[PDB]
Structure formats: C-alpha cells, structure tokens
Amino acid sequence: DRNSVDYAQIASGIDTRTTVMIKNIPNKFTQQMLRDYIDVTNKGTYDFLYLRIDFVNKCNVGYAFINFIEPQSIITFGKARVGTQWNVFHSEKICDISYANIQGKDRLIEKFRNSCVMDENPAYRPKIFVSHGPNRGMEEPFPAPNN
C-alpha cells in the first residue's frame, strides 16, 4: 500500500518520508517504556514522539507517531525491531511500522499544540526533541497553544 515501508526505497532516496506509525503496541505499554525501547537502537535519531493514553480504559491507543530526523534511521529501527515480539505482559504482538498520513515535525506540532491532550499529566503529553546540532535528541519544551 501507499504507507508500506520498504528499506531499499529509503536507501536509494526515492522515499524521504520521516513520520512513521509504530504498530501493535501492547495495551499496558507506557510512553516511557516506548522511549526506552526506541533508545536501544535509535537514541538521538527522532524529534517527535507520542504514544496516546486512553485514561478511561487504562491503556495506550495501540500505536505511536515517531518522526525520524533522517529517513535512514527508519532502516536502523526497522532492521532491529520490525518482525520481533514486544515480549512484555505476555503479549503475542509483534512490532511493525507503516508511514503516517501526517508528515514532519512542524505538522505534528500543529496537530497537537491546540489539542486537549496537552491538559493531561505532563509526563504523558506528546514530545519534541532538538532536530540538529550538538544537542540533537534533547527534549525541547512543547510549543504552547496557538489559540
């Protein structure tokens, strides 16, 4: 499909999309567990991260948005994790990815800055990180509502 990830197309430079959906996330996985999981192989390679929590059902939504700074970092993540089991909470689910319909850190910021999710516990809010320079990967304060 239009959102399937093909590592060879990324390597050859014919698909430069950077926003990816991390799929089949176990119900009880947290955003901290996801950040740590990604940091095993991809620390400092992404500049947007969000795993939405459903507070009523005590679970995450099952997928996360991640914006990689360089499209090549999708190969690093994918080749290490895609097709492997999460191996937490006795889940049978496997890590998988596809491209998101929304593309880029700026579009992601604009999608959540005015959202009601910014009113929840600061620890569970979407995150942005420095995209370039010596501090690349360091968390940045999320921009305030545009209204």
Residue numbers in the entry: 580 to 726
What's in the article?
To gain insights into RNA recognition by RRM3Mei2, we solved its crystal structure, which revealed a unique organization as the classical RRM fold is extended by the N-terminal helix α0 and by one helix and two strands at the C-terminal extremity. Using isothermal titration calorimetry (ITC) and size exclusion chromatography coupled to multi-angle laser light scattering (SEC-MALLS), we found that RRM3Mei2 tightly interacts with a poly-U15 in a 1:1 stoichiometry.
